Design a protein around this ligand. Structure first.
Ligand SMILES: [Fe+3]
Length: 185
């Protein structure tokens, strides 16, 4: 377990950690957090959109994980979502994001109430899965875009969004804005 000097070193260390069948969550998280964000490494991937956050595939981890870069303009946020029974790691490359944690609702139609909120700041790494709960991620800054590195294992194409007033959920299909530095409409 060595320090990733560059995003390309990190990706090679991640391939080594996902060699087996099972995941060492704490080791993944330590090494993601040890990579010092350098914009020259991931410039190619930071493709923003005026209206919402963009998802930009970086590496597909020999089928074991998706590594992607999320770009969040001012005020861009996600909905309340689960992660499809996968692991989710989230490292901040630039700016800050607010994360809000929710519990799985009851089949009762009811407002969903926050368990907790917190700020994720530059270079920190957060971890979530469905057994911890639901969450919402947002760039609440009026001035500064945010960029995060995201790692999901196993990969998933879809997830569920939750309406905060009802807890009712809807299945959603992930879109890539770009793959490997190349935009894809
Ligand atoms: Fe998420």
């Amino acid at each position: 377990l060595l320090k990733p000097r560059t995003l390309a070193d990190l990706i090679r260390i991640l391939h080594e950690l996902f060699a087996g069948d099972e995941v060492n969550v704490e080791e993944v998280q330590a090494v993601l957090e040890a990579y010092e964000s350098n914009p020259a490494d991931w410039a190619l991937y930071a493709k923003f959109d005026q209206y919402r956050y963009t998802r930009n595939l970086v590496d597909q981890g020999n089928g074991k994980f998706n590594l992607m870069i999320l770009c969040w303009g001012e005020g861009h946020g996600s909905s309340i979502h689960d992660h499809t029974d996968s692991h989710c790691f989230l490292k901040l490359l630039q700016g800050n994001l607010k994360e809000t944690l929710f519990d799985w609702p009851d089949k009762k139609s009811n407002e969903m109430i926050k368990k907790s909120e917190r700020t994720l700041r530059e270079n920190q790494c957060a971890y979530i899965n469905d057994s911890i709960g639901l969450h919402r991620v947002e760039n609440v800054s009026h001035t500064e875009p945010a960029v995060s590195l995201h790692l999901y294992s196993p990969p998933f194409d879809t997830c569920h969004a939750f309406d905060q007033r009802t807890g009712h959920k809807n299945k959603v299909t992930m879109t890539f804005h770009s793959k490997f530095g190349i935009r894809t409409p």
